[PDB]
Amino acid sequence: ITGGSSAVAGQWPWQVSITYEGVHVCGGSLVSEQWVLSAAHCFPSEHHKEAYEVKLGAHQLDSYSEDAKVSTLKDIIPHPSYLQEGSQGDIALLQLSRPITFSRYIRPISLPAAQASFPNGLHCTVTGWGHVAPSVSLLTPKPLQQLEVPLISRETCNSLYNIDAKPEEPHFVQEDMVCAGYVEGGKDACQGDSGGPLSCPVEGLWYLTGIVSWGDACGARNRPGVYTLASSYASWIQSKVTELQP
Numbered sequence: 634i635t636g637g638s639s640a641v642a643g644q645w646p647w648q649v650s651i652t653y654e655g656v657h658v659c660g661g662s663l664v665s666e667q668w669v670l671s672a673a674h675c676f677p678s679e680h681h682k683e684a685y686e687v688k689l690g691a692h693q694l695d696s697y698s699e700d701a702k703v704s705t706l707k708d709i710i711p712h713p714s715y716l717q718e719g720s721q722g723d724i725a726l727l728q729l730s731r732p733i734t735f736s737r738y739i740r741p742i743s744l745p746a747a748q749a750s751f752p753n754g755l756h757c758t759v760t761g762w763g764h765v766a767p768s769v770s771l772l773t774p775k776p777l778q779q780l781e782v783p784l785i786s787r788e789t790c791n792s793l794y795n796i797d798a799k800p801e802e803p804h805f806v807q808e809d810m811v812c813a814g815y816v817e818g819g820k821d822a823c824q825g826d827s828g829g830p831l832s833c834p835v836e837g838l839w840y841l842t843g844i845v846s847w848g849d850a851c852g853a854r855n856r857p858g859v860y861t862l863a864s865s866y867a868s869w870i871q872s873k874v875t876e877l878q879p
């Protein structure tokens with residue numbers, strides 16, 4: 634996260650870190666006692682399932698926390714349209730090896746209904762342990778960063794991505810995506826934030842509106858972060874979680 638600040642412990646208790654062979658590769662969001670939502674592209678076919686871990690309840694990746702729990706994965710389920718076509722569906726359900734017990738530091742985020750709309754301009758918050766500027770890592774002890782970002786409609790977002798774009802660069806924000814950020818850049822999600830939550834405030838609660846998916850260089854002007862919309866997958870998520878491990 635570029636242009637944000639460090640979250641206090643417990644602030645975003647659904648944020649998880651997904652590591653592969655012990656190295657943080659992506660964020661995710663706890664959504665039930667045994668399921669995490671993250672981005673499909675975080676889970677290349679080459680990678681071995683048993684080498685992944687999910688760390689929950691920790692705000693600093695390098696610091697021991699008595700409130701932290703770390704889990705392996707029983708299953709990784711990318712949405713089929715990601716595997717089949719690869720133009721969208723950048724979302725995956727991760728089933729933890731064992732169900733977790735919630736605490737003050739580990740709580741699920743509510744998912745939006747299929748037709749939930751989150752208005753352009755809503756100030757949501759993206760969180761993660763990704764780069765804090767293009768080509769600049771978050772330093773040890775790796776405190777979770779948070780950043781307030783207004784929602785930007787996919788239509789505005791496409792127009793912005795088209796400014797000074799190369800005609801042949803895939804910069805299309807699909808129907809299952811939304812953007813968030815600033816036209817002027819400087820504040821955005823960056824590499825390593827992939828898969829983590831865009832949390833939006835609604836009726837006194839927080840909902841998982843988006844999953845950090847892609848963008849151009851972090852914080853570039855005219856290139857706000859792009860997120861997979863959780864609403865677009867609500868029926869599928871609810872079906873999978875309920876069928877497999879309710």
Ligand SMILES: Cc1ccc(CO[C@@H]2C[C@@H](C(=O)N[C@@H](CCCCN)[C@H](O)c3nc4ccccc4o3)N(C(=O)[C@@H](CCc3ccccc3)NC(=O)OCc3ccccc3)C2)cc1
Pocket residue numbers: 659674719720721722723763767803804805821822823824825826827828845846847848849850851852857858859
């Ligand atoms: C539907 C769909 C299909 C395929 C994808 C996968 O796109 C990959 C993962 C994503 C990615 O990097 N997201 C990170 C979160 C970004 C937050 C928004 N900022 C995430 O944390 C992460 N994921 C990583 C994977 C490997 C290594 C490091 C990774 O870090 N990319 C990108 O962001 C590409 C976008 C190109 C693109 C456009 C349309 C479509 C598919 C790809 N942007 C980029 O490389 O930056 C441009 C540049 C110019 C110059 C210098 C540096 C960077 C590529 C996603 C969605």
